[PDB]
Amino acid sequence: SFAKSKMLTYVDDADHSVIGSSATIQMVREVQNFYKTPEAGIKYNNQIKDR
Amino acid sequence: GIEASYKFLFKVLYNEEVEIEIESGAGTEYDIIVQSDSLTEDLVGQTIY
């Protein structure tokens, strides 16, 4: 699983002059097929907000 | 369980020629051009006719 915190560890690490950092992540699943969803359909395994 | 197992198997066993058919087989290459629309691609590996 991916952790925005555990990634944030190393971005903290890089300088030692960085006083803070933060970010807003969006998962990206690029889709090969538009016209038809894969009949099964994609899933992120992770629920998302509405709209 | 390899393919070659099968063919070899009688060579020792039956010392006679056998062939066993998988669709993929040795022959691989393709010429036509398909027009479809957003097919699931799960059919990759799955034959059509």
From Swiss-Prot, chain A:
Q: Where, per UniProt, does this protein localize?
A: Virion
Domain of life where this protein originates: Viruses
What triggers its expression? Answer: Expressed in the late phase of the viral replicative cycle.
Q: How does it assemble?
A: Homodimer; each gp6 molecule in the ring interacts with its two neighbors, forming an N-terminal dimer with one and a C-terminal dimer with the other. Heterotrimer with gp7; gp6 is part of a (gp6)2-gp7 heterotrimeric molecule. The (gp6)2-gp7 heterotrimeric molecule further interacts with gp25 and gp53; the gp25-(gp6)2-gp7 module is involved in sheath contraction.
Q: Which family does it belong to?
A: Belongs to the T4likevirus baseplate wedge protein gp6 family.
Q: What does this protein do?
A: Baseplate protein that is located next to the tail tube (inner baseplate). Involved in the tail assembly. The gp25-(gp6)2-gp7 module is involved in sheath contraction.
What's this protein's name?
A: Baseplate wedge protein gp6
What residues of the intact protein does this structure contain?
A: 458 to 508 of 660
Swiss-Prot record, chain B:
Location of this chain's protein in the cell: Virion
What function does the entry list? Intermediate/inner baseplate protein. The gp25-(gp6)2-gp7 module is involved in sheath contraction. Involved in the tail assembly.
Subunit arrangement?
Heterotrimer with gp6; assembles as a (gp6)2-gp7 heterotrimeric molecule. The (gp6)2-gp7 heterotrimeric molecule further interacts with gp25 and gp53. The gp25-(gp6)2-gp7 module is involved in sheath contraction. Interacts with gp8. Binds to gp10 homotrimer; disulfide-linked. Heteromultimer with gp10; a gp10 molecule is disulfide-linked to gp7 and the other two remaining gp10 molecules form a disulfide bond.
Family, per entry: Belongs to the T4likevirus baseplate wedge protein gp7 family.
Name of the featured protein: Baseplate wedge protein gp7
Q: Which organism is it from?
A: Enterobacteria phage T4 (Bacteriophage T4)
| Gene that specifies this protein | 7
Q: Which residues of the full protein are shown?
A: 739 to 787 of 1032
